[PDB]
Amino acid sequence: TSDLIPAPPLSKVPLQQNFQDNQFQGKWYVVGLAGNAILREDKDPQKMYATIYELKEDKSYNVTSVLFRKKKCDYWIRTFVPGSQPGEFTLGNIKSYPGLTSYLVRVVSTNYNQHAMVFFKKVSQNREYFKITLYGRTKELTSELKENFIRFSKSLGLPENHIVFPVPIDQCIDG
């Protein structure tokens, strides 16, 4: 009833050295999206969405994703609590998500003011999902950065049809 490309070993997922949590704050556009549950679709292409990171006093992120769906703005809210090392996080209040037993975030690379690559691994209803997101501070990034994202996604076992580049939009994500 479900087939998934296996999640890579964490050894294949680099960590951004000297992660600066204050500089990673603010709005990021999802210009690239890859994962074992991500599928390319050409009848209904994925629309670009935005994810806003806000550091609280206790140094956990409030993470709000803003999606344009059904002619309305949908808000997906979660909390990233600092993990085993800087640039790694786990999900706050995992009990609120039914079936979710694990959720790991790892910032693979970033220059903070233009681009980032972030790796996610979650175990939900015993199934191990993973995704990589190419974050852009703007809605567009260079071909070099996008090709690097594709290369990295492929290095984690993902084929091309599991790698998408959401189409830029103006609704919801510009506020």
Q: Contact, 55 vs 165, CB < 8 A?
A: no
44: its two tokens: 């209904």
* For the chain, the helix, strand and coil percentages under 3-state DSSP, each to the nearest 5: 15, 45, 45
Is there a binding annotation on residue 131? yes
Consult the annotation and say whether 129 binds a ligand. no
> Which residue number, 19 or 120, has a Cβ lying nearer to ligand QED?
120
Single out the residue of 8, 82, 92, 157 in contact with Na ion (rule: CB under 5 A).
92
What's the min distance (Å) between Cβ of 48 and ligand QED? 11
61 to 80: interface string for Na ion, x by CB under 5 A: -----------------xx-
Site for Na ion in 141-160 (CB under 5 A): 159-160
Min CB(91)–ligand QED separation in Å: 6
Size of the site for Na ion (CB under 5 A): 8
Q: Pick one of ligand QED, Na ion, none as the site partner of residue 54 (Cβ within 5 to 8 A by kind).
A: none
CA distance 43 to 70: 16
Query: Is 103 marked within a binding site?
Result: yes
**CA neighbor of 150 nearest in space, from 38, 3, 23, 28:** 38
Please identify, using beta-carbon distances, which residue of 17 and 93 lies nearer to ligand QED. 93
Q: Which one of Na ion, ligand QED, none interacts with residue 73, CB within 5 to 8 A by kind?
A: none
Within 10 angstroms of residue 86's Cβ, the number of other Cβ atoms is 15
Closest CA to 85 of 38, 17, 162: 17
Cα separation of 31 and 63, whole Å? 17
Say whether 50 counts as a known binding-site residue. Answer: yes
Judged on CB neighbours under 10 Å (0-12, 13-18, 19+), 65 is middle
Stretch that binds Na ion, among 44-52, 83-91, 125-133, 139-147 (CB under 5 A): 83-91
Binding site for Na ion (CB under 5 A): 78-79, 90, 92-93, 102, 159-160
